[PDB]
Paper text:
However, the interchange of one or two loops within the Abl SH3 domain produces a noticeable reduction in its stability but does not promote the formation of 3D domain-swapped oligomers. Conversely, replacing the RT and n-Src loop residues in the Abl_Src chimeras with those from the c-Src SH3 domain results in destabilization under identical denaturing conditions. Notably, the Abl_Src-nSrc and Abl_Src-2 chimeras exhibit pronounced destabilization, highlighting a key role for the c-Src n-Src loop residues in determining the stability of these chimeric proteins. Meanwhile, the Abl_Src chimeras showed lower Tm values than the WT protein, and the chimeras most affected by the exchange of the loops are those where the n-Src loop of the c-Src was introduced. In this way, the ΔG values are the same for the WT and Abl_Src-RT, but the Abl_Src-nSrc and Abl_Src-2 chimeras show a noticeable loss of stability. Although the conformation is slightly different in the RT loop, the hydrogen bonds are conserved. In the n-Src loop, there are significant differences between the WT protein and Abl_Src-nSrc, but also with the Abl_Src-RT and Abl_Src-2 chimeras. However, Src_Abl-nSrc shows an ordered distal loop in most of the molecules in the asymmetric unit and this chimera does not form the intertwined dimer. The same behaviour can be observed in the Abl_Src chimeras, where the distal loop shows low B factors. Indeed, even though the Abl_Src chimeras are less stable, this reduction in stability does not allow formation of the intertwined dimer. Meanwhile, the behaviour is the opposite in the Abl_Src chimeras, and the Abl_Src-n-Src chimera shows higher solubility than the Abl_Src-RT and Scr_Abl-2 chimeras.
Residue numbers in the entry: 64 to 120
Write the structure that this text describes.
Amino acid sequence: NLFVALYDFVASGDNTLSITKGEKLRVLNNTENGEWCEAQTKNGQGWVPSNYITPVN
């Protein structure tokens, strides 16, 4: 479940997580992933747009 961020995204609140273009992240197998998916990086865990990331492996 390794992904890389395609575009910068800035958390606006509501358990969202900021990510940076090129950042590697892990998508947790959260039971409620959807248009948004729960990601994990060194800056925390939180929702990111599913269309802003792409799988790596």
